[PDB]
């Protein structure tokens, strides 16, 4: 054929891929974490947005730290050969490097490690997108007037 | 013949490292509200890093906190894009 370039990811496989949304609103009382009012508005906006981009969306609510790690493990063991990409959205409390389950924390590196190039082979070479709405510490930005 | 195992990841964080992230109890979080609006308007038009750049500008210019507590009042936010991608990403194709 004619001249061909390779500067963009191939996105015309038969499926766009999975979009997993983890929405943690209510936490166990012993943790002392407050309820995250407004997060169901976020989860519904994301489901409609990624539906229109032709992602297979799966929504999960109020998961424990054990449930988050078992979900991520099982999803990374599916066959993604006919999928172009992978998307995961996390909505919860957090600190630097950490996201909370309803009963305690999960390191973010533990979650993304299931999708590494050597451990999820049907996603090797394909874009893996993690979107994170959570605190990363306790500093506040005072801004500057323009 | 090999690629790094950490290649082809993108992390779209709602706030800068070390900072709180803001959420409105009626309207949703500043970052997700803004992300969904910019995907709706530009996913058929712009590459994904340029969409996330417009999300950074919307969060930084259009939101400011309101609180009866002086410590938490009149505060601002900037999201943080972390890319290990090796190619351009478009949500549409030919």
């Amino acid at each position: 054929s004619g001249i061909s370039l390779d500067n963009s990811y191939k996105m015309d496989y038969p499926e766009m891929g999975l979009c997993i949304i983890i929405n943690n609103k209510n936490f166990h009382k012993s943790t002392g974490m407050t309820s995250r009012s407004g997060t169901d508005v976020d989860a519904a906006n994301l489901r409609e947005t990624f539906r229109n981009l032709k992602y297979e969306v799966r929504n999960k609510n109020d998961l424990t730290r054990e449930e988050i790690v078992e979900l991520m493990r099982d999803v990374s063991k599916e066959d993604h050969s006919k999928r172009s990409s992978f998307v995961c959205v996390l909505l919860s409390h957090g600190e630097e490097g950490i996201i909370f389950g309803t009963n305690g924390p999960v390191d973010l590196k533990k979650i993304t490690n299931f999708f590494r190039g050597d451990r999820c082979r049907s996603l090797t070479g394909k874009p893996k997108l993690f979107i994170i709405q959570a605190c990363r510490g306790t500093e506040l930005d005072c801004g500057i007037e323009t | 013949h090999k690629i790094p195992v950490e290649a082809d990841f993108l992390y779209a964080y709602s706030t800068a490292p070390g900072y709180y992230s803001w959420r409105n109890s009626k309207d949703g979080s500043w970052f997700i509200q803004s992300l969904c609006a910019m995907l709706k308007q530009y996913a058929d038009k712009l590459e994904f890093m340029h969409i996330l750049t417009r999300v950074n500008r919307k969060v930084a210019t259009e939101f400011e906190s309101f609180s009866f507590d002086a410590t938490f009042h009149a505060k601002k936010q900037i999201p943080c894009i972390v890319s290990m991608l090796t190619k351009e990403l478009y949500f549409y194709h030919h």
Partner: peptide, 4 residues
């Protein structure tokens, strides 16, 4: 407005 609340923080995460």
């Amino acid at each position: 407005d609340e923080v995460x």
